[PDB]
Amino acid sequence: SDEVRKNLMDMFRARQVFSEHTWKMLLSVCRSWAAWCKLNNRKWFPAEPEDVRDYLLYLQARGLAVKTIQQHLGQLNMLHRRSGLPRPSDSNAVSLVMRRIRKENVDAGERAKQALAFERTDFDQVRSLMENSDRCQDIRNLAFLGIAYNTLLRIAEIARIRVKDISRTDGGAMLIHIGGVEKALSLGVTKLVERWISVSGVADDPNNYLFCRVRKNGVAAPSATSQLSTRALEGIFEATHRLIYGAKDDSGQRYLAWSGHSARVGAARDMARAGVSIPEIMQAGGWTNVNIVMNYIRNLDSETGAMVRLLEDGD
Amino acid sequence: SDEVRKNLMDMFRDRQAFSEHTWKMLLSVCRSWAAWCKLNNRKWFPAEPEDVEDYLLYLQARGLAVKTIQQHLGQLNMLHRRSGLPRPSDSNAVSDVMRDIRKENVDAGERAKQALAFERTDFDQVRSLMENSDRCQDIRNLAFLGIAYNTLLRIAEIARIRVKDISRTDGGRMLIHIGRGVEKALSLGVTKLVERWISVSGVADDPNNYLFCRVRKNGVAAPSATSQLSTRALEGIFEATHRLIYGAKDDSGQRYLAWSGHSARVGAARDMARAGVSIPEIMQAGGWTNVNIVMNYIRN
DNA sequence: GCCGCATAACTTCGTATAGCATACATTATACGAAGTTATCGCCG
């Protein structure tokens, strides 16, 4: 440990700093390698292409997702470059191994996984159910869900939202500007969020964040700083899935329940089935032209084939 | 030439997989390079970045398309790689020249050219013209075209099609499963057309056998249990019919002076775009991944 | 009115996995041409 700690501090003395995810993951990798390499009683710091290859094949016996391994290799080349060692690990052995394990895993026919959608029908059902709720937590949560299903923001960005951002206007319509884009909230959900705001008294200071901690007492306490409890919001999605359905399946699989994506996905598919003009959608999404969108669209019934009819028809 | 044969067989040593197209084009690039390099009396096998520079300058003096010059560069990289030599031609000079000549070529403002469209209206016209025709080879060609405009594929895909592929159903509708795959449907009038072809020809009694097989100047057809690779001949059909609706080609020698294998697919695509409907599901049925090319079929 | 200590909400960590902009690597097309084939023409 102290070896990697020291080496990473010596790198940090270059005063380059990664993303926190980046640096985290990097250190994790360094741990993993040094531990396996010591287990094989090989020098942990200086790599060897046959030792790296053996490691890689050990990982393949571990059954890891190829992408992971690839990521490992990337990390290693990164370390070389930024250490000033040969950025590429010796490509013949490395690339031949990569090609082998790539093709061998592709031959499994495995898929890049997709989060389950959250439907508009589910949203309407949970609205009908929770609208009866007197619990301010339930009011807040339904308001949050309505906001999400309108705006489809990044979860961290909806967590970022701060009362100085928010404005509302005729009909009770509400508008929120963020770095710089303003999005509009439709009248009924402006009234719902007003109910939340007024009942909680949360964030009377516009510095303060719209959603704030609520104790088991049922008491909100405002915060002048972000709670960042995105894991808690994910727990909300779990709870609501565990309300419309039971607990998660015992398979230990991912995507066994709704996730912060799932609403985004759902509304995207809803717009696709509505068939509204595509560039409109992409502009509203702030979105690069992306076949991801079409992988959404991919999962839809539209296969009418009318041209056979029109050929037979039209006469 | 035999020197080039020896040289390329030598480098072909350390054999590795290619498409036949890829190996053909590789060998053609090697021909061009070896001829040029011998003309320059330079070492044929080892590269030098100043030699690559001079070669590229010569290719620019020939005014070849920058895409093809780049492709040659690519091929050179390839041969280094697979022979075990350094992939990159020394990048800073190479890249700088690349960029500069790229800019200079884009400064020409040239267009991506597009094949001559074909319409339902054209189909109607040619059908009205040829429906009187007794020649079974004409019935063959027309049946072929009516399928193509129903299905709008690669020419290779339609070539593959085998009588075992084909079935027909209620209303006399006919369905064909193709690729790994998709089943497509044939509209009634062209069903009757293709049935006339099949019944008159007697072709492919075994469903192994292909729907279209050779004709003879005798006015005779010979069935084939094997793919005949008609496709170039099918292009000849497209050209012949173009030379029926019009005279000979212009002497400009340009591409897209007449209908091409694209022409039916692109045509029906624009037809649907003018119908203005079903964008994603029709793109699905044609199998395109979303691309600006689709837009420039649609754009007008 | 203090000790016990709970459920709950929340922080942090681990690791297995998913996004994506770009350069340049792999496959196909469009075309003019040479070369085939076997079948009929038909001399006198």
Add this chain to the structure above:
DNA sequence: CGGCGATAACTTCGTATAATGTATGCTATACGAAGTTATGCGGC
């Protein structure tokens, strides 16, 4: 009379140009889990 001439109807080849694909350097995320706080629920 049946040869070669000529053909239809076809195939293999060489040229130049595009369409198609992906992996690379950097980012963020899904789900379990231990651990944390805390104050309020329970007793006498």
